Amino acid sequence: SCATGPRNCKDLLDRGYFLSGWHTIYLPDCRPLTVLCDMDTDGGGWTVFQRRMDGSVDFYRDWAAYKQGFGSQLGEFWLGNDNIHALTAQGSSELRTDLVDFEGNHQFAKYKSFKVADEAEKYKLVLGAFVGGSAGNSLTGHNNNFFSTKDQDNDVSSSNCAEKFQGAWWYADCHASNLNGLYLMGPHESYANGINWYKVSEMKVRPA
Numbered sequence: 001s002c003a004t005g006p007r008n009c010k011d012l013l014d015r016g017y018f019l020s021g022w023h024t025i026y027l028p029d030c031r032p033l034t035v036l037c038d039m040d041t042d043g044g045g046w047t048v049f050q051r052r053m054d055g056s057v058d059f060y061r062d063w064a065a066y067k068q069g070f071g072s073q074l075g076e077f078w079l080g081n082d083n084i085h086a087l088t089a090q091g092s093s094e095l096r097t098d099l100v101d102f103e104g105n106h107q108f109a110k111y112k113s114f115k116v117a118d119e120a121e122k123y124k125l126v127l128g129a130f131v132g133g134s135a136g137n138s139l140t141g142h143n144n145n146f147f148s149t150k151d152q153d154n155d156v157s158s159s160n161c162a163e164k165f166q167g168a169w170w171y172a173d174c175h176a177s178n179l180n181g182l183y184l185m186g187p188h189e190s191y192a193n194g195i196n197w198y199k200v201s202e203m204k205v206r207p208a
C-alpha cells in the first residue's frame, strides 16, 4: 500500500530494481501511478514523463488531454501535467532530456532543477540552470512560462504558438518547434522526418 510503497523511480532503484520498465509508485496523496523508470542512463532512477520514437501517437491535443496524459506504455506517451506536477512537488528535482537522431547518434541535456506548478498556475515551468549536455541548451528562454495548448493560448506571442507548431509546450515567443511538435513523416531518405529540439525523445526527472 501507500505507506510502504515507493514514491518514484529513485526509491525503486534503492530497493533493487535495476532494469528499466513500468512500475507502480505512489503519488503524495497516495494515488497509485504506473510510471516508466530509466534505471540505466546517467546512474538510473529517472522517472520518464515523455517519450516519442515513431510518430504513431498524435501529440496535437487539447488542454484536458495534456492534463490527464495520453498515449501508450508500449510506445509514445505524455505522462500528464497533474502527474508531472505531483512528481516535482515534494523536495527538489533534476531534469534530463535524451535524444537520438536518425543516424543513431545519442545526445542529451541536463538541468539543475525542474518544477511544474499546479493547474491554477497554468502548469507554469520553473527551470534551473543548464548543467550541460551534447544536445545543447534549448529550454533556456522557457523558464517561468505557462503551459499552452491549441485551445488555451497562454504564451506571450500575438500568434497561437501551439497551433503554429502543432503541439503543446511552455511557449514564450515561438521561434522554433519543440519535443511535443509535429513528428514529420516524409520519405525515408529525406530530412523531413522526426522532431526538433530527432528520431527519439525522452524527458525524465529524479530527486536532486
Ligand SMILES: [Ca+2]
Residues within 6 Å of the ligand: 153, 154, 155, 156, 157, 158, 159, 160, 161
Ligand atoms: Ca498568443
